[PDB]
Amino acid sequence: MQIFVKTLTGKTITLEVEPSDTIENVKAKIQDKEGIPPDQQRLIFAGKQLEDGRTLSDYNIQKESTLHLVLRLRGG
Amino acid sequence: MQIFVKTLTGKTITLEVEPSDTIENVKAKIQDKEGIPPDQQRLIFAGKQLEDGRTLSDYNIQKESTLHLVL
Amino acid sequence: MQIFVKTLTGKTITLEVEPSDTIENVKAKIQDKEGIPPDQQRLIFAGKQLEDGRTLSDYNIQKESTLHLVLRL
Amino acid sequence: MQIFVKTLTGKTITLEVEPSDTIENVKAKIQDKEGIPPDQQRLIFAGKQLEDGRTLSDYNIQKESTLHLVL
Amino acid sequence: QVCTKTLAVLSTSFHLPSFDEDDLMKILSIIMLDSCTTRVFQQTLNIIYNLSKLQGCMSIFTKHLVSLAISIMSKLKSALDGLSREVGTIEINSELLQKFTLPSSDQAKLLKILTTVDFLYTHKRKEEERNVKDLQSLYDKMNGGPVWSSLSECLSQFEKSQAINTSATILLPLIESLMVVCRRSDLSRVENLFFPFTDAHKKLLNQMIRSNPKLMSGPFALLVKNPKVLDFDNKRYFFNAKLKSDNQERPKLPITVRREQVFLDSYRALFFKTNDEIKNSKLEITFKGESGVDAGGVTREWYQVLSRQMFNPDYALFLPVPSDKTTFHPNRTSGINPEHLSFFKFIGMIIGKAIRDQCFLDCHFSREVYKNILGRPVSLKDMESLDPDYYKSLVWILENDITDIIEETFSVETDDYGEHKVINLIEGGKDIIVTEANKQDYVKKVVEYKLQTSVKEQMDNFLVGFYALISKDLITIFDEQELELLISGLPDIDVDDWKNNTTYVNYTATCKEVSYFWRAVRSFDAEERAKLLQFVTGTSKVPLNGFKELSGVNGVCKFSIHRDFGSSERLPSSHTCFNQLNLPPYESYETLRGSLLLAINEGH
Amino acid sequence: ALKRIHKELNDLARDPPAQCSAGPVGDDMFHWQATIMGPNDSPYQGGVFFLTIHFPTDYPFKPPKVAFTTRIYHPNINSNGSICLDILRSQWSPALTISKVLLSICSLLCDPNPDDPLVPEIARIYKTDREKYNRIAREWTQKYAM
Amino acid sequence: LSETKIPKELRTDALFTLECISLKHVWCSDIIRNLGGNISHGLLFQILRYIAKTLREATDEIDEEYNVRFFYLISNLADVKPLHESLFAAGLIPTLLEIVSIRNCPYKRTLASATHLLETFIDNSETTTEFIENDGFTMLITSVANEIDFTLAHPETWQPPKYSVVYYSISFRELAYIRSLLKLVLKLLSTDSGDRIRNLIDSPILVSLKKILENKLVFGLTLITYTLDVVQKVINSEPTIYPVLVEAGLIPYVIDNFPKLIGPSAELLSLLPDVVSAICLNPEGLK
């Protein structure tokens, strides 16, 4: 199916994902469009942070779902 | 809040600090508790050395944070 | 398109370039019209220097836009 | 980036440097490529001798710059 | 001076000489001499101060000084009266002009006397805090009120009369004297006269400062106590001098940052240094993989790109104010990233350095940020900038009517990244219903939460980061408008980019009317260009990217010019909702320029 | 003259002679500092000599003023640095270039002009004893040029 | 100049001695201090205002030699940087503008000298801004336009010199005055950034320049040279202004009548190629 990813105030983008794929695949598919490396992208849904290991099925993701994208604030 | 400082072989010590406290104040408290001068103390958190001129909030140090002391 | 380059130590010259042209092409044309080697050339537009790797469209340089040429050692 | 270094008393070579590199680093690289220690190397560019304490950025040395060696 | 310094050292620490009132008056008479130049006056001040350390010398000094001041003011009153009368009647008579222009004029001697007494009662650095009372008593004992009133009348006459040109500077020393009698009193008697006098004569004060900025280093520094009088030019010159007063050499601090990740690279390189190090360090930037850029040039590009990246909403640090995309305010949800406090502090220090470096930033902050950094409390007036229309609704609720139309409660509903949340303005705020009996507190709580509480920690970190480079007391001398001008500067609207990224209807890029319009625009001042841009789009700030980023109510909308067939006398019209400009086809360039000037000026 | 000095410096930069180098001093393009290496098979061989060049406001229509900052031994060169060369005195033409001047100076270093010298003593010792002139030149170069 | 008791010859000799002393930079500071050139109400500016007053009220009291010598002395003093800043702060430009802005004054020598001093003084951005804020551009445009129009409209006043080969018919007082005005225009074009030069050139001045070009036989090769220099400089700086000159009919006149404008004058001949290049800056000009 298809999913939507939106920034705080920027445009919205569409990805072709399936429940089994890990968040790594979603981050990579985001990268091809914007170019942000996966290590820098922070993906959130329903106000809860996501993890690379888990997948859409783990986060009960479904069709026409909107996720929120942020750029990592590396601490050092 | 309170933070914990642990050495390679020694025990762990507790320091009561605040976000505005600078790493220099942390070293001063360490000296007061153990006597080690600040120049002989090296502080590491998350694998990153801590500079004297900065504070705890700069390095994302929070309550119960664990730091490594190397001499 | 046509752009102008003002030499702070001389006159103004005209260059026929395109937005996609890189700053290196502009430097080469400036050398052709003046003879200054590109490495000696420093270009200024709206108070900011220009990087050879970037293009005119990146710096928002349009038709009739006037750049300034200075030399630095 | 690449730089050009002609030995007036010998042959010419090419090196790789960075703007922040000091002239001492350039002389060390010259020694590595040739062998003569920096103290004996004499560096000239634009008609002025190059000082170890200085750097390429201070001297405004650019890419493909041609310097002269006296040994 | 040498002999008296040795004598005082011996006394404080064989037979010692004893001075008598006649000798003290004799040495004081040096001040009255027409030959008392700056060096002579300074040496005489040192001699008098050294003598004062001997018992009984201070009382005699004070008595003689007050007597001399009374005597000189006796003549100064009549001289000022005559000068004001002549100015009102009016070339000015040379005879009375020489009474002020000459270095032996009574005004110079009065200034010297006042400076001498101030030096006597101020070089006692450990006693000034308690000697201020007796110093003010001595100044009042000189009954200088009539002289101050006459000086005020003379300055008023100078303001009214143009036949004297800018000759008011002949009274420059006397004005200085006034400052001397007020620099020690409390300004947070003569005290009641300082503020009204400066308020009345700010024009002359600013003119004098502009002509001779060095005066700020002298008694005129007291004018900081009344920042309203100082014009932005004089204020900024003084601020630059004070901030640069620590003229210590700045060590160079070369860095290397990638253009794409300039924000994070700069954060790593600089945020992990010493505050004083960055304060006193000159930054030499070196973009990774760049070419043909000198050390100085890269700094401006680095500042520009770093400012552009910091306020990128994708970082969840700052959000663009609605209708004011150019200006941003701190983001409430910045808590998603644990390091947001440190990054806010880094933004503060970089802004402080930019102010120190005199590198203007196109970024803008809502009025709340400026007011808070200046220490002023934030109210609905700041809310106007952030939400103009919504602020209008709030004020309409508060005053324009008795509301009671909406069932809103004392709580705010928000959607944090898909998570719906409710925040109570006050305890039990969710259930309490907003009514006319509790609307006055409701609006206050709403604005306080929106502007201050919702950003408390982030704005505190931003402020502490900023103050690390600029003293809070040193920056509070400005105001909201002046502070904004300090960071961003006067807006500069480009002409080529504006022209290329424009559209026409019933007109062409080569049309005679379009050519006339662009010729007129290119012949406008920067302020005039900003005024025209505001008249066209409603705001004086060009979009971050440029004129290709022009946006309206419906989104992106480039500047458009449309022919108007109405009477040529019709003033050009505009619709800011779509950056639309309906222009009549003026036959002549001069007529078009005049009409456009009239339109843009009447817009404000 | 700026348009001429620019191209002169550009020509030197493109194909600089390995025998000599020069450039602006303090970014003052009318003030130049130049370096010369002693000609091969010469008493000055292996040395480094510094020269100061001032370009007249009417350059190239007037010769540049070139002075030897470094002490040197030569019949036509005075200790104060003044140079006695034909191209810089009477044979100057706008067609000449600073690189050509440097090459001519380098040639003169190994090819003195005793018949028309600047300091009589050096010319006289040269004429009377070539070997003594070579020895003293070598010693002076070692003392200062090295 | 205020006191009439001092003999005129003695006053002029004293002024000449002051100028000769001021030729050396060491004593320029002392001269400024004595004359009060660092204060807006000093003797220097009093003399400036008196010169303006006597010019406004025509009388035998005018001393053209004294005025020119005083302006030369002021220029010599301003040759020093700190003294230049002191004079600028004291308000020299407003007083010089007051002198220059006089209308219908027949004493063209004093006006020309004052304009030359003003042109020399205006050096940097701050001085140009001070000149503009005092209505400098409008007064300059009015002066140029009215001077040229009056010169062309009154052949009777013409009295060109004898005992020399000249290519003009005007009395050389108007010639010198107009030359000083055009020199000031060129200086403003040079020092100005470029944004504000449109407020000056894009004005009735172009009509006056076109009249000068159309009346070579009346105005002379010197004025032709200065007009062509102004055109070339304004085209070189802000080349986008080229169409404006085409609308005024100036560049078309220069192109059509290029052989006519050339004359035996070293500066004009040396300028010619620069004019051709400036014209060629635009593709239509090149064609």
UniProtKB/Swiss-Prot annotation, chains B, D:
It is found in: Cytoplasm; Nucleus; Mitochondrion outer membrane. It is a peripheral membrane protein. Changing R54D: Decreases affinity for UBE2R2 in CRL2(FEM1C)-UBE2R2 complex. Changing S65A: Prevents phosphorylation in case of mitophagy. Decreased localization of PRKN to mitochondria. The record marks H68 as: Essential for function. Residues 1-71 form the Ubiquitin-like domain. Changing S65E: Phosphomimetic mutant that binds and activates PRKN. There is a cross-link at K6, K11, K27, K29, K33, K48, K63 (Glycyl lysine isopeptide (Lys-Gly) (interchain with G-Cter in ubiquitin)). Phosphorylated at Ser-65 by PINK1 during mitophagy. Phosphorylated ubiquitin specifically binds and activates parkin (PRKN), triggering mitophagy. Phosphorylation does not affect E1-mediated E2 charging of ubiquitin but affects discharging of E2 enzymes to form polyubiquitin chains. It also affects deubiquitination by deubiquitinase enzymes such as USP30. Mono-ADP-ribosylated at the C-terminus by PARP9, a component of the PPAR9-DTX3L complex. ADP-ribosylation requires processing by E1 and E2 enzymes and prevents ubiquitin conjugation to substrates such as histones. The modification (Microbial infection) ADP-ribosylthreonine is found at T66. The record marks R54 as: Interacts with activating enzyme. Changing K63R: Abolishes HLTF-mediated polyubiquitination of PCNA. Exists either covalently attached to another protein, or free (unanchored). When covalently bound, it is conjugated to target proteins via an isopeptide bond either as a monomer (monoubiquitin), a polymer linked via different Lys residues of the ubiquitin (polyubiquitin chains) or a linear polymer linked via the initiator Met of the ubiquitin (linear polyubiquitin chains). This is Ubiquitin. It comes from Homo sapiens. The chain holds residues 1 to 71 of 685 of the full protein.
Curated annotation (Swiss-Prot), chain F:
Its EC number is 2.3.2.23, 2.3.2.24. GO terms for molecular function: ATP binding; ubiquitin conjugating enzyme activity; ubiquitin protein ligase activity; ubiquitin-protein transferase activity. GO terms for biological process: protein autoubiquitination; protein K48-linked ubiquitination; protein modification process; protein polyubiquitination; protein ubiquitination; ubiquitin-dependent protein catabolic process. The keyword Iron-sulfur does not apply. It catalyses: S-ubiquitinyl-[E1 ubiquitin-activating enzyme]-L-cysteine + [E2 ubiquitin-conjugating enzyme]-L-cysteine = [E1 ubiquitin-activating enzyme]-L-cysteine + S-ubiquitinyl-[E2 ubiquitin-conjugating enzyme]-L-cysteine; S-ubiquitinyl-[E1 ubiquitin-activating enzyme]-L-cysteine + [acceptor protein]-L-lysine = [E1 ubiquitin-activating enzyme]-L-cysteine + N(6)-monoubiquitinyl-[acceptor protein]-L-lysine. GO terms for cellular component: cytosol; extracellular exosome; nucleoplasm; nucleus; protein-containing complex. Pathway: Protein modification; protein ubiquitination. Keywords: ATP-binding, Nucleotide-binding, Transferase, Ubl conjugation pathway. The keyword Magnesium does not apply. Residues 1-146 form the UBC core domain. The active site is at C84. Changing R89A: Abolishes histone H3 ubiquitination and decreases interaction with PHF7. InterPro entries: UBQ-conjugat_E2_core (IPR000608), UBQ-conjugating_AS (IPR023313), UBQ-conjugating_enzyme/RWD (IPR016135). It comes from the Eukaryota. Accepts ubiquitin from the E1 complex and catalyzes its covalent attachment to other proteins. Catalyzes 'Lys-48'-linked polyubiquitination. Mediates the selective degradation of short-lived and abnormal proteins. Functions in the E6/E6-AP-induced ubiquitination of p53/TP53. Mediates ubiquitination of PEX5 and SQSTM1 and autoubiquitination of STUB1 and TRAF6. Belongs to the ubiquitin-conjugating enzyme family. This is Ubiquitin-conjugating enzyme E2 D2. The gene is UBE2D2.
UniProtKB/Swiss-Prot annotation, chain G:
Belongs to the UPL family. TOM1/PTR1 subfamily. This is E3 ubiquitin-protein ligase TOM1. The chain holds residues 335 to 621 of 3268 of the full protein. Interacts with the ADA3/NGG1 subunit of the SAGA complex. Interacts with KRR1. Present with 350 molecules/cell in log phase SD medium. It is found in: Nucleus, Nucleolus. It comes from the Eukaryota. Probable ubiquitin ligase protein involved in many cellular processes, such as transcription regulation, maintenance of nuclear structure, cell cycle, mRNA export and rRNA maturation. E3 ubiquitin ligase proteins mediate ubiquitination and subsequent proteasomal degradation of target proteins. Involved in transcription regulation by interacting, and probably mediating, ubiquitination of some subunit of the SAGA complex. Required for SPT7 ubiquitination. Participates in mRNA export from the nucleus by regulating the transport of hnRNP proteins.
